[PDB]
Paper text:
One of the most highly conserved sub-families are the [name] proteins with regulator of G-protein signalling ([name]) domains or [name]-[name] proteins. Other well-characterised family members include Mdm1 from Saccharomyces cerevisiae and Snazarus (Snz) from Drosophila melanogaster. These proteins have relatively low sequence similarity across homologues and across species but share a conserved architecture with an N-terminal hydrophobic membrane anchor, and a central [name] domain and PX domain (except for SNX19 orthologues which lack the [name] domain). The N-terminal membrane anchor mediates localisation to the endoplasmic reticulum (ER), and the proteins typically localise to sites of new lipid droplet synthesis and can enhance membrane tethering of the ER to other membrane compartments via their PX domains including the vacuole in yeast, the plasma membrane in Drosophila and endolysosomal compartments in mammalian cells.
We next investigated how similar the experimentally determined [name] [name] domain was to the predicted structure from the AlphaFold2 database. Side chain conformations in general were likewise closely aligned between the experimental and predicted structures. The predicted structures of the human SNX13 and SNX14 [name] domains from the AlphaFold2 database are generally similar to the experimental [name] [name] domain structure as expected, but with some notable differences. In general, the three domains have relatively low sequence homology, and this is reflected for example in a significantly longer α3-α4 extension in SNX13 compared to the other two proteins and.
Residue numbers in the entry: 449 to 564
The structure:
Amino acid sequence: ILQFEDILANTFYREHFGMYMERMDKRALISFWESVEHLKNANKNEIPQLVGEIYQNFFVESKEISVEKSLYKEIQQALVGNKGIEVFYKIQEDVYETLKDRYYPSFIVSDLYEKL
Ligand SMILES: [Zn+2]
């Protein structure tokens, strides 16, 4: 019996969850979670590109993540180099709880979960 942690940890399972999110027309939430998981495990030399891609694909070219304005300053301050990339790790925890509480319960009754 798979749980949400098992879904995200297996790449096959996670691709099926992402397909579900595209059917819910909200694949930017899993994509942003996937981007910060890359940044968390990446070589130090790809970090600059990865951070700029996170702030452009999300927060600029798309506007689907829910931070509003309080933490948005922290993002800009991490892009310039004052603060660190820990702001993205906290936003990833908030997006994880969102996927877990309001999208995973719908996912476990779809065939993208039940046939795994
Ligand atoms: Zn990499």
